[PDB]
C-alpha cells in the first residue's frame, strides 16, 4: 500500500452531497416587459465573454401541412440582409464585435444567439433585434436558397442518426404535429415564397413566447433598458391563440409501430428503439434522467469500455455488439421519448437489439443501490459541467423559462435528484417500459433486424 497514492479515493460508489457547491453559484434575475417578453440574466463575476440571444416557443410542431419547413427556411433567409443593414454591413459589424451569430430550429424551440465579448452587449442586442424585426426576406435570396436545398434533398445529404430519428418521430407520432420533420417535404420547398415567411413570423414570434436570455458578463438593468428600446415593439399575444390553446387543439399521439429504410449496398445498420416517455412537466422526468445516465453511452474509440459501471456498456463493449451507441431521453410539451440509439452492422444487429431490450426490461425488476448512487453523482456532475460554459447557462435559462415557466434553482434541482432511489427507478421503469408498446426505427443494412413481434415479445418476462 502506497501511503500518499492510495488515500482519498476508492471504487466503492457512495452518495455525494453537492450542497457546498451552491454557495457561490450565481442568481438569475427575470424582468417581464409590458410586451410580455421576459428578460433574464445570470452574471458570472469575472467573465470576459457573453452569450445572449432570443429563445422562442415555436418551431416545426406549430406549422401546418401547407407551410411545413418555413421555420427551417427562415434561418437560411434571415441572415441575408435586413432593411437597415446589407449583407456586407452585417458581416463587417459582426466581425468587428469579434463574435459569431448562430441559430437552431427544433420541433418546439428556436433560438438565435450571439457569442460575443462583454463590451459588445448592446451592439449584439441591436443586431439581433435588427434581423428579428426588420428583415428584407428578399425573393432573390429565397430563390438562391431554394435550389441549394433542393440539390441537397436530391442527393439525400443527411446524417444517418438524424435520418433514423426523423423516421422514429414520424412513426411514433403518426397523425400528430410532432411527426413532421423540421426540414419539411420537397414540395413545400419547391413552392415557398416570402408571404408564408411573413405570416409565420407574424403569427408565432410574439411577446409571451420569447425570452431574451444572457449569461456571462452582463448587467441586468442595462439589458432591461436595451431590450425595452429594441424588442419593445413586438406584438402581444391573443388569449385564444396562446401556446396552451394550440397544444390542446392538436395533441400528441403515440402509436406502437415499426419502420425500416433498406438500402441495397450499405455497410452500417443504424437503429433506434424508443418507448413513450415523459413530458417536460411530469415529475417522473427526473428519474428518467437518472435511468438514462444508468444506461449511458459508448463508442469504440474508447478502450476502457469493459470496466464501465453500466451493464449495457459492458455487454456491448465486451461482446463487440455495436460500433457506437447512446441512450436518449427526449422531452416535449405533452409527451416524450426514452430509448437507445446505436450503430452496428447486419451480423450483430439482432444481438444488439436483444441487449437493448434485455437491459431495458431488467430495470423494472433488479436495480441495485450502487448503480443509482453512481448515476446520481454522474448526473449532478454533468449539471455542474454545463455551469462552466456561459453558452450552456444561457441555453438553460431560455429553455427553462420557455418550458417550465420558471427558473428552477440549483438547490431545488439537487434536492429533486437526491430524492431518487432504487424503488423510484423500479416504479418509473414499470410505468413506462414493462409490457408497453414501443417504436422501432432502422436504416441501412437492415435485412436482419427483427420485426415488430420480436420486439413486442421482449418487453416482458414470462419467468416472474
Partner 1 sequence: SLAKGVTDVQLATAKNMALGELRASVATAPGLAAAVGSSVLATGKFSANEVAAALSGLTAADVTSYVNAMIKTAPTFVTYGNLSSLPRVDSIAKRFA
Binding residue numbers for Zn(2+): 72, 152
| Residue 370 binds: one of partner 1, Zn ion, ligand CDL, none (C-beta under 5 to 8 A by kind) | none
The single residue among 68, 292, 390, 459 that binds partner 1, judged by CB under 8 A, is 390
Q: By CB under 8 A, what part of segment 48-67 binds partner 1?
A: 48-49
Spatial separation of the C-alpha atoms in residues 20 and 130, rounded to whole Å:
43
Stretch that binds partner 1, among 92-100, 187-195, 248-256, 418-426 (CB under 8 A): 92-100
User: By beta-carbon distance, which residue lies closest to ligand CDL?
Assistant: 462
**453 contributes a contact to ligand CDL by CB under 6 A:** no
**Nearest residue (CB) to ligand CDL, 365 versus 404:** 365
Query: Among 305-313, 323-331, 333-341, 455-463, which window interacts with ligand CDL (CB under 6 A)?
Result: 455-463
461 touches ligand CDL by CB under 6 A: yes
Rounded to 10 deg, the angle between the 369-386 and 422-432 helix axes is 90
Decide: is 458 part of the binding site for ligand CDL (CB under 6 A). Answer: yes
Residue with cell 422531452: 331
Residues with Cβ within 8 Å of residue 313, at least 6 apart in sequence? 296, 297, 298, 305
Q: What is the nearest approach in angstroms of ligand CDL to the Cβ of residue 50?
A: 54
Please, what is the minimum distance in Å from the beta carbon of residue 75 to Zn ion?
A: 8
Task: Check binding of 123 to ligand CDL (CB under 6 A).
Answer: no
**Residue 334 grid cell:** 405533452
Question: Which of 263, 328, 354, 434 forms a contact with ligand CDL (CB under 6 A)?
Answer: 354
**Is 75 one of the annotated active-site residues of the chain?**
yes
Exposure on the CB side of residue 283, measured as CA atoms within 13 A? 7
- Residue 72 contacts which entry, Zn ion, ligand CDL, partner 1, none (Cβ below 5-8 A, type-dependent): Zn ion
What DSSP character marks residue 182? S
Residue in 27, 63, 91, 145 annotated catalytic = 145
Give me the torsion for CA of 379, 382, 386, 389, rounded to 10°: 170
CB of 274 to Zn ion, least distance (A): 22
150: enclosing H helix or E strand: helix 139-154
Under the binding rule (CB under 6 A), the answer on residue 456 touching ligand CDL is no
Q: Is there a contact between 277 and 432 (Cβ–Cβ < 8 Å)? A: yes
Residue 92 binds partner 1 (CB under 8 A): yes
Q: Find the binding residues for partner 1 in span 272-311 (CB under 8 A).
A: none
DSSP 78-130: TTS-BSSS-HHHHHHHHHHTT-EEEEEE-SS-EEEEEEEEGGGHHHHHHHHHH
User: Which CB contacts under 8 angstroms, 24+ apart, belong to 13-17?
Assistant: 13/309, 13/370, 13/371, 13/373, 13/374, 13/377, 14/373, 15/373, 15/376, 15/377, 15/418, 16/377, 16/380
- Binding residues for ligand CDL, rule: CB under 6 A, are 354, 458, 461-463
- Binding residues for partner 1, rule: CB under 8 A, are 47-49, 92, 95-99, 115-117, 388-390
Residues acting as catalytic residues? 75, 145
Amino acid at each position: 500500500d502506497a501511503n500518499p497514492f492510495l488515500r482519498f479515493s476508492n471504487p466503492r460508489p457512495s452518495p455525494i452531497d453537492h450542497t457546498p457547491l451552491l454557495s457561490t453559484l450565481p442568481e438569475t434575475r427575470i424582468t417581464t416587459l409590458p410586451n410580455g417578453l421576459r428578460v433574464a440574466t445570470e452574471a458570472i463575476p469575472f467573465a470576459e465573454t457573453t452569450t445572449l440571444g432570443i429563445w422562442i416557443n415555436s418551431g416545426s410542431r406549430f406549422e401546418t401541412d401547407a407551410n411545413n419547413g418555413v421555420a427551417h427556411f427562415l434561418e437560411h433567409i434571415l441572415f441575408k440582409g435586413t432593411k437597415n443593414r446589407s449583407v456586407k454591413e452585417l458581416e463587417v459589424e459582426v466581425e468587428n464585435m469579434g463574435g459569431q451569430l448562430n441559430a437552431y430550429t427544433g420541433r418546439e424551440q428556436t433560438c438565435y444567439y450571439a457569442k460575443v465579448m462583454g463590451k459588445d452587449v448592446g451592439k449584439a442586442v441591436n443586431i439581433l433585434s435588427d434581423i428579428l424585426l426588420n428583415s428584407n426576406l428578399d425573393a432573390r435570396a429565397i430563390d438562391k436558397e431554394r435550389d441549394v436545398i433542393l440539390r441537397e434533398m436530391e442527393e439525400v445529404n443527411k446524417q444517418t442518426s438524424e435520418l433514423v430519428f426523423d423516421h422514429l418521430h414520424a412513426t411514433a407520432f403518426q397523425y400528430s404535429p410532432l411527426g413532421r420533420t423540421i426540414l419539411g417535404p420537397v414540395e413545400n420547398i419547391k413552392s415557398i415564397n416570402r408571404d408564408q415567411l411573413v405570416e409565420y413570423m407574424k403569427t408565432h414570434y410574439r411577446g409571451p413566447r420569447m425570452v431574451l436570455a444572457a449569461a456571462g458578463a452582463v448587467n441586468h438593468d442595462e439589458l432591461v433598458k436595451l431590450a425595452s428600446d429594441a424588442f419593445g415593439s413586438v406584438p402581444d399575444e391573443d388569449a385564444a391563440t396562446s401556446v396552451r390553446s394550440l397544444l390542446v387543439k392538436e395533441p400528441s399521439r403515440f402509436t406502437g409501430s415499426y419502420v425500416h429504410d433498406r438500402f441495397p449496398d450499405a455497410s452500417e445498420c443504424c437503429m433506434a428503439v424508443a418507448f413513450k416517455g415523459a413530458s417536460w412537466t411530469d415529475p417522473d422526468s427526473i428519474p428518467l434522467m437518472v435511468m438514462q445516465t444508468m444506461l449511458g453511452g459508448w463508442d469504440k474509440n474508447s478502450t476502457v469500455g469493459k470496466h464501465s459501471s453500466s451493464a449495457l456498456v459492458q455487454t456491448v463493449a465486451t461482446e463487440g455488439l455495436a460500433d457506437a451507441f447512446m441512450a436518449f431521453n427526449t422531452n416535449y410539451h405533452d409527451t416524450g421519448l426514452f430509448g437507445v440509439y446505436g450503430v452496428t452492422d447486419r451480423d450483430r444487429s439482432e444481438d444488439f437489439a436483444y441487449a437493448i431490450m434485455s437491459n431495458l426490461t431488467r430495470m423494472c425488476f433488479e436495480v441495485r443501490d450502487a448503480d443509482v448512487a453512481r448515476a446520481k453523482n454522474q448526473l449532478k456532475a454533468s449539471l455542474m459541467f454545463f455551469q462552466d460554459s456561459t453558452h450552456h447557462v444561457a441555453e438553460s435559462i431560455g429553455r427553462e423559462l420557455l418550458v417550465y415557466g420558471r427558473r428552477i434553482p440549483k438547490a431545488e434541482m439537487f434536492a429533486r435528484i437526491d430524492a431518487v432511489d432504487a424503488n423510484a427507478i423500479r416504479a418509473v421503469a414499470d410505468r413506462f417500459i414493462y409490457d408497453q408498446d414501443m417504436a422501432v426505427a432502422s436504416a441501412g443494412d437492415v435485412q436482419f433486424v427483427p420485426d415488430y413481434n420480436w420486439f413486442r415479445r421482449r418487453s416482458y418476462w414470462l419467468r416472474y
